[PDB]
Every structure is written in C-alpha cells, then in structure tokens.
Design a protein around this ligand. Structure first.
Ligand SMILES: O=C(Cn1nnc2ccccc21)N(Cc1cccc(Cl)c1)c1ccc(-c2ccc[nH]c2=O)cc1
Ligand SMILES: O=C(Cn1nnc2ccccc21)N(Cc1cccc(Cl)c1)c1ccc(-c2ccc[nH]c2=O)cc1
Lengths: 306, 306
C-alpha cells in the first residue's frame, strides 16, 4: 500500500554524467559509448546568449577548445558537431558504464525521472510530467544545464530530456537527445514565455483508479456521462478534452477495479463541480495529474483492495 | 527555481542490493563488504509469523540454509548471526561496489530516500519523512522487505532504514541497520497499530522559508508571537510544540530571508487559523511537513529572490 511520486533508480544514468567546459563556460553532459552530448550554449559567453549565431560560434572552436571531465579523468575530444541544439563531442574513450539505451521523444502528459546534476556530479532525482505547454515544473539552479530526464524499461534507459533553460515563470525547457526543443522555445534571449497550460485529464483519471486499487471509493457515484458532456465540464475547469483513445488506454485499470471509464468520468465531473469537501485522495487535497496510467500499473498492486 | 520532493541519487545503493532466500521465503538484502543484512523474518514460513521464536528458528538453520543472489551470481554463505531484528550473513566475496558508508539511527521528523526493491532488483526511489509516530508513509508491495532508506553526504552513504512491515493503516515500519525497530513495533503478528501522529512543525516552517527564498511572501504578516502563544495554537491543530532548539535550527534560513523565526511562526499561526483561501505555496494547497531545514538549504538557491 501507499502511493508516492516515485522515480526510476538513477544508477545507470549517474555513470554517464560528465562536466563539459568551453573556456569559462561549464555545464553537464551525457557520455554514451564514445560520444558526449551537451547543450550547444556551452560554446557561448554570457553576452553571446543575447543573439548567438551557433554555426559562427562553433566554426571558431577546435576539438581542444573542449574539456570533458569524467570524475577525475580528463577525456580527450577528437571530434565535434552540432545536432540541432546539442553539441556531440567524440572522445578517445568509450564509457565502460554505458547502459543499454535509446533516445525517445516523449509526448505531452508523459512522465520521466530527472537526474539533477551540477559540475558533472548528480545531486538529486525526482519524477516530472511533460506539461501540455511543453515545459516541466522542475527544480533546477544555475549549473544544472545538461541534466537529463529518462525512463527505464528492463535494464534499457530511454533518454528523453536534456535541460537548457528556466523561463521567466520559473518552469523549465529543454530538448530531446536529438537536440530538438520541446515546445516553441529557442536557445537565445527572447520574450518567449510558457504558454497557457491545462490539467492532464488522462492522468487524473489514472490516479483515481490508483486510489480505488489502494481501497478508496468515497468519490465514486451512481452517475455515468457521455464523452461530450464530460468535455463541456473539462472546458470550464481547464482540463484537456477526453478522447476515445484516452478511454481505451484506461481499459486495463477499468478491468482491474470493475469501474467503467465513463463512470470514473462522472466521479471526476462531480469532484470538479463540488470540490473535495475537506476530504483527501491518496493523501492529496487536489486532483493529481503527474501519474500516467502506466505509472499507476507499475506502482500499484495487481490485486484491488475490494 | 522550483521545489520538488527530491531523493538522493540511488546508484551507490543499487550496487548493494541482493536477494536472500531461506527455503520458500525470499526478500531483499544489503551487501556491504563481506556481510549481507536482511530482515530476520526471512527464516520464517508464513505460519511462523504468528508467534515466532527467532532464537529457536535460527539454531535450526545452517550456513547453506541461505541462498544469496547478486545479479546472476550466487554468493556462498560462510557465517550467520542475528543482531536484534536483522540477520547478518557472512559471504565468501566482498562487494566490490561497496560505497563509503555509515549506519545511523535517524530521529523523528528527519527525511531519507527509499530504494524500493523486489527480488534484489531496485524498482524505484522516493523521499520519505520518519513520522513522529515512528512510521513512514511509503509505497511498498509484498516482496519489498529488506528495501533500505539512506542519505548521501559527500560520497558517504548513511543507511538509516530497512523495511520489515506494513501496518493495518497502510503505513510502514522497519529498523535501523543494527536491527532496532523505529517505534514500539515487533516482527510478529500482534494488534500493533500506528500511534496517533502529529504534523512536523519545524519542517512546515522550513518549507515556508523555501517558498520565500523562491520569491513568494503572500502568507507573511505584520505580527510576531511568543513560543508559548504559538504552542497553544499548535496544540489545537495537532502540530508538534515548537522549541527553542527548533528556533535555533531555523537561524540560517531566517538570516537568508531576513524573516525572524517568531515572525514566520506568526505567519504559520495565521495560515492555521484562516486557511489558504484558495492560494498555493510552492504549488501546494496544504502545509507540507516532509522537508527538513537541511533539505531546503540543499535544494534552494543560496540567493533569495528579493
Ligand atoms: O535559463 C538559463 C540557465 N538555467 N537553466 N536552468 C536554470 C535554473 C536557474 C537559473 C538558471 C538556469 N539561462 C537563460 C537562457 C537565456 C537564453 C537562452 C537560454 Cl537556452 C537560456 C542561461 C543563462 C546564462 C547562461 C550562460 C551562458 C554562457 C556562460 N555563462 C552563463 O551563465 C546560460 C543559460
Ligand atoms: O507486512 C508484511 C510484509 N510487507 N511489508 N510491506 C508490505 C507491503 C504490502 C504487503 C505486505 C508487506 N508482513 C506482515 C507482518 C506480520 C507480522 C510481522 C511482520 Cl514483521 C510483518 C509479512 C507478511 C508475510 C510474511 C511472510 C513471511 C514468511 C514467508 N512468506 C510471507 O509472506 C512476511 C511479512
């Protein structure tokens, strides 16, 4: 029993974190096989951030413009290239701690673990969601750029995020491990801001199923809803519209608890309209949206507490 | 910016997790140097849990009654002894991944990271507090016994918890790494229940200082309080009494934000009496008590957003 915002064990990723220095500028990088990946803003001075031409900044560097430190070991850079908003540094040594890995581009609403790093040293791990507005509500200080997000499946690390920026509202923006930003953001100083965000409906439904699995039914009711009537309520409360694909994804949870998806939707409509009236769900007074249906199945018992 | 329930990176502990089997009974153990530590209930059948005499159950075992599996490697047991509610197994191999470590007995209100394990395989990591009632609000399923809690300080792992039991209210009980239970609990079937719990006052004050560091002052007020007048309010709301020692611990946070501790206490008295009136603090609608003053300093900027 219990339900916590659980991260994946971080060891497989800790063994891949290094420090990358170009002159006075330092941040973190990810060392897989004989390549180091890092934010391309490592080649900038603070003043270069105002309006950098990365092509122009990079052609002015050599291999030896870059220092890579792995623990107390200097790695020699033997090649370099830009890939979208990342630099790829070829190094003289393959990382002997390289796990089985993949690079994946996650979708909005999906969750991942972040390993917060400073100076190539891991400091902490926590679980995030990719918001609908393509930001993450992380916890990062200056020096955290190049920190990575990931999932683990059967000893394979799926890297999905590399940290680049804190936006003016204190949320975070970054790239996949091909250096494409999540959302409309750019690695230069502009008036860019986080767009309006929405609650991840699918995740709130998954977490209601988690509270039932764990033995709580108080918020259920005798009503059902149509998807259209649910979505008129969602629009009012700044919830993502629910789709048939979302209903289908909730099938396994529905089957484990014997609660039809649209009957769970009816419960959520009533929670949104009426509020929680001093009650909690899995220890929370608000409707949590940072657990996917997959996260609930990973963490909860396969046996409902009936 | 941001504030998250952050765990310590788990790698140093992942490298120490093994599986311990005595007949049909399996759980996790911790492999440091040439010793494996695990809950002594590994020597029980399910029926033995009703009223086990561990001295009597153990004298009936040999070294070869115990199988220890580290990945796909069988470790041979060459000695065994009971230490309070743990078994200590001597093995033929020193763990080459043993980190610098210590065993510490933490105090109520202090936090640690849990590495949830099944069959000697780590599955997840999350941060907990030791409740005043000597339980943790973990997330554990059957098979999780022998999972450990820890802190990390400068590459030294301080082990503080080993998982033994889920109590009837779905919270968790365990031991230090000398096998002494936290709280009044015993490793046998009794009517034992979690005692009444209280909110960790010190931690709520630390988290209010975190919200100020991160740039939020909305809940502050022009009042001050005495420690006695604060504690009459604490008694009413099931908060731990605040002590002078707690005031002294908050000195560094007070100094960083320029808010006197008793002025922060006055803010908390007003939040308890009036509620949050639809507002949030660091994204929360409730007063969070699972961050210590040390956790706030670790995670937050050394520079207040003034
Ligand atoms: O948000 C960042 C870096 N950040 N990432 N999480 C953070 C959390 C807290 C504080 C800062 C953080 N920005 C701003 C930015 C502006 C424009 C484009 C981008 Cl992509 C990022 C940043 C600021 C300074 C520098 C810099 C470059 C060269 C030498 N020295 C430096 O400081 C780099 C990035
Ligand atoms: O709470 C546990 C084991 N637990 N720990 N977190 C859990 C989370 C979810 C479910 C069970 C969990 N109890 C109960 C208990 C009773 C009396 C004393 C203690 Cl100390 C623990 C437990 C139940 C069964 C067995 C058992 C022993 C031998 C062979 N097979 C078995 O199943 C061991 C412990």
């Amino acid at each position: 029993s219990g339900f916590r915002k659980m991260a994946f064990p971080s060891g497989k990723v800790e063994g891949c974190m290094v420090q990358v220095t170009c002159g006075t500028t330092t941040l973190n990088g990810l060392w897989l096989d004989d390549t180091v990946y890092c934010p391309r803003h490592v080649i900038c001075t603070a003043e270069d951030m105002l309006n950098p031409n990365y092509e122009d900044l990079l052609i002015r560097k050599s291999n030896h413009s870059f220092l890579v430190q792995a623990g107390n070991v200097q790695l020699r850079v033997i090649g370099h290239s830009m890939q979208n908003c990342l630099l790829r540094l070829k190094v003289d040594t393959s990382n002997p701690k390289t796990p089985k890995y993949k690079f994946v581009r996650i979708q909005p609403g999906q969750t991942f673990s972040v390993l917060a790093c400073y100076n190539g040293s891991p400091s902490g791990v926590y679980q995030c969601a990719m918001r609908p507005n393509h930001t993450i509500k992380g916890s990062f200080l200056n020096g955290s750029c190049g920190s990575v997000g990931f999932n683990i499946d059967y000893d394979c690390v799926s890297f999905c995020y590399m940290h680049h920026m804190e936006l003016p509202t204190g949320v975070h923006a970054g790239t996949d491990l091909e250096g494409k930003f999540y959302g409309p953001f750019v690695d230069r100083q502009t008036a860019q801001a986080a767009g309006t965000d929405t609650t991840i409906t699918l995740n709130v439904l998954a977490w209601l199923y988690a509270a039932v699995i764990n033995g709580d039914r108080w918020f259920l009711n005798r009503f059902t809803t149509t998807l259209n009537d649910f979505n008129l309520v969602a629009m009012k409360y700044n919830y993502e519209p629910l789709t048939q694909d979302h209903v289908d994804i909730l099938g396994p949870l529905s089957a484990q608890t014997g609660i039809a998806v649209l009957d769970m939707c009816a419960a959520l409509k009533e929670l949104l309209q009426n509020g929680m009236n001093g009650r909690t769900i899995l220890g929370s007074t608000i409707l949590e949206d940072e657990f996917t249906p997959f996260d609930v199945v990973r963490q909860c018992s396969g046996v409902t507490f009936q």
